[PDB]
């Protein structure tokens, strides 16, 4: 099975500290605060806020074409993608707010611009079809930062950083 577009997926990652390993899912809520967060699993507690739709999928050339002009397809490594949040209808984006050399990651409704675009990359070839069960690296088209699993005081967080994180994107 290979990942396609217009799908409903869950972005998961593996967090290990003090030898305790767990699966975390990316999530958010439309109300008030905009930032995303992570839920522990085992299936996460809340799954409605945990689902994303692969609305679009373009080449970087194509994406930049449309932008410059204004001045169920499959996914391929290197392509930029757009992830809408089922609940809020807003879009997974990379913000310009920090937390300190890392940006915040949240929802926003404005789908124009590069901030809401994430290029997908392989764990270890560009142009190849993305197979379900593959691990993905996501890079922000706007900032060129990575969707990153971060650790704070007591909790795990997500941000756009200079270091990478592997994401188990899968449907359900």
Which domains are seen in the chain, by residue range? 1-172 (2.80.10.50)
Cα 9 from chain centroid? 10
To what resolution in angstroms was this structure determined? 2.6
Q: Which residues does a chain break follow in the chain (C to N more than 2.5 Å)?
A: 42, 71, 99, 124
Tokens for 126? 């560009």
Burial 9-27 (b: 16+ CB within 10 A, else e): bbbbbebeeeeeeebbbbb
**Residue 131, beta-bridge partner list:** 2
107, 92 Cβ separation under 8 angstroms? yes
How distant, in Å, are the alpha carbons of 102, 104, 118, 132 from that of 110?
22, 16, 15, 29
Q: Quick one: how many helices (H) and strands (E) in the chain?
A: 1, 12
């Amino acid at each position: 099975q290979f990942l396609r577009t217009d799908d409903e997926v869950v972005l998961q990652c593996t967090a290990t500290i003090h030898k305790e390993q767990q699966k975390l899912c990316l999530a958010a809520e439309g109300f008030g605060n905009r930032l995303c967060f992570l839920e522990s699993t085992s299936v996460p507690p809340d799954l409605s806020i945990c689902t994303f739709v692969l609305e679009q999928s373009l080449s970087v050339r194509a994406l930049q074409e449309m932008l410059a002009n204004t001045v169920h397809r499959t996914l391929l490594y290197g392509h930029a993608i757009l992830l809408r949040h089922s609940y809020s209808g807003m879009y997974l984006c990379c913000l310009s707010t920090s937390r300190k050399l890392a940006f915040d990651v949240g929802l926003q409704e404005d789908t124009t611009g590069e901030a809401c675009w994430w290029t997908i990359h392989p764990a270890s070839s560009e142009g190849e079809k993305v197979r379900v069960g593959d691990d993905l690296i996501l890079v922000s088209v706007s900032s060129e930062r990575y969707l990153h699993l971060s650790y704070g005081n007591s909790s795990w967080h997500v941000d756009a950083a200079f270091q990478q994180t592997l994401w188990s994107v899968a449907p359900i």
